[PDB]
Subunit: 113 residues, 3 copies
């Protein structure tokens, strides 16, 4: 049975301005392992990754009905799909992410069998 | 058991032009109760409230697989619960209705899933 | 019991360029029946149909955990019923498939949920 559902949309411009102002933004939004991936990328690619991780965590927060990013983590499997490797929920989590050159979107569904 | 699913995306500029046109748009899309909330807001937040209610209603109609016109907007209503989240207070369905809405300074999006246990 | 979930967004301009290439884009992406519907439309409405079928096929591939470039375009088919709702008439899956599509002047998006 379903126990929650949430979505989010975000402009890349908002993430770009946030990086400059408080140059510690990333350290507070990403975990250690996520951070390693961030620094290895460059250009638009680097910004698109940070933006997608922020949108995914926000969708999950809305799905649980609450308003701690450090106890949430999103990685990529060998085929390339994104999945939650760490979260305060013991059921199953179904996630998906997509983008364009101007913004990103994400969708989450929570289930308990 | 899932019994339906629908989504919608809309440009804010399109909703703003319709209101400025002075054609009775808001009165056609919103109920009396929804209208009371609309008039208490100001600026961009006022336009985003109308846009969100329009997007959610169109999304529900696709989940039913009928589209909206065979059924007007006055047959549906969306308010905010005691936790502050949007929900359907009126609709022709007896099961559980899962709804979510989001926006930026240029677009608004909505998603609906129907279920019965 | 849910078994998969996926979403996708596509730029109209990108589909247009692919077509302008003349390569033979539409022929590799659409089935015989989808193509017959495509040729009966014109103008913007024509470019919107092709873009929507591409977005839908990619959302299903991601819901299964892969990509459309690997699964193959000719193995999936999307039609419209007598009320206008879109649905999958052919696919390599045994359960139920729930789909929805929406568009603006510049973009198109789609969402899929798999159930067994
Ligand atoms: N009765 C119905 N139920 C569910 N979806 C419908 C419907 N009639 C039309 N649609 C869908 O809504 C889409 C129109 O998008 P929108 O009005 O949100 O911009 C159509 O795109 P297609 O004709 O390309 O399949 C179609 O998929
Ligand atoms: N095999 C796969 N199955 C499902 N999703 C996949 C996938 N391979 C890549 N993706 C996703 O597609 C996203 C890119 O979306 P787009 O379709 O607009 O190009 C990737 O973003 P990330 O690499 O940041 O995780 C990733 O989440």
């Amino acid at each position: 049975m379903i126990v929650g559902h949430g979505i989010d949309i975000e402009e890349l411009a908002s993430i770009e301005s946030a990086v400059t102002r408080h140059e510690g933004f990333a350290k507070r939004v990403l975990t250690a392992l996520e951070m390693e991936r961030f620094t290895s990328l460059k250009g638009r690619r680097q910004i698109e990754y940070l933006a997608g991780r922020w949108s995914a965590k926000e969708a999950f927060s809305k799905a649980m009905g609450t308003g701690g990013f450090q106890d949430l983590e999103v990685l990529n499997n060998e085929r390339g799909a994104p999945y939650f490797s760490q979260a305060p929920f013991s059921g199953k989590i179904w996630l998906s992410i997509s983008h364009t050159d101007q913004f990103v979107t994400a969708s989450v569904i929570l289930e308990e069998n």
